[PDB]
Amino acid sequence: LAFGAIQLDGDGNILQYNAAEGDITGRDPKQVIGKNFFKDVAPCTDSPEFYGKFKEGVASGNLNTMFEYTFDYQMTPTKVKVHMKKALSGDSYWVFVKRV
Ligand SMILES: *C(=O)/C=C/c1ccc(O)cc1
């Protein structure tokens, strides 16, 4: 499948969410955009190795990291590879997701 892609602001609010990501997770993009990724849609990502690294990277202005993660919240459990990095646009961060 095509990468899943999510664009977040620095607080973790979902600004963009593509169809491929919804195919991985079962989420309808229009129902999650505008909600908080870490505190509402994806609470299983509220961990030091995901959310904690996100916040560090937002703070430092240097976010660019890759890691494996399990997406198992209100979906058939799926191992994924995550790449999060700062965007070019203002107050924007990308999360790219591939099944592994
Ligand atoms: C854990 O709560 C993960 C949930 C999640 C991951 C990625 C998404 O796009 C949606 C939900």
Query: Is there an atom of ligand 1 within 6 Å of 21 CB?
Result: yes
The three state secondary structure string of the chain is CCCEEEEECCCCEEEEECHHHHHHHCCCHHHHCCCEHHHHHCHHHCCHHHHHHHHHHHHHCCCEEEEEEEECCCCCCEEEEEEEEECCCCCCEEEEEEEC
CATH architecture under which domain 1-100 falls? 2-Layer Sandwich (3.30)
Atom 6, ligand 1: residue with shortest CA distance: 42
Mutate to test the pocket of ligand 1, among 41, 67, 76 (most ligand atoms within 8 A of CB): 41
Q: What is the resolution of this structure in A?
A: 1.1
Mutate to test the pocket of ligand 1, among 30, 38, 47, 73 (most ligand atoms within 8 A of CB): 73
Cα–Cα distance, 58 to 98 (Å, whole number): 22
In sequence order, which residues have a C-beta less than 8 Å from that of residue 25 and are 6 or more positions away? 4, 71, 75, 78
Residue 70, both tokens: 């399990």
| Sequence spans of domains, the chain | 1-100
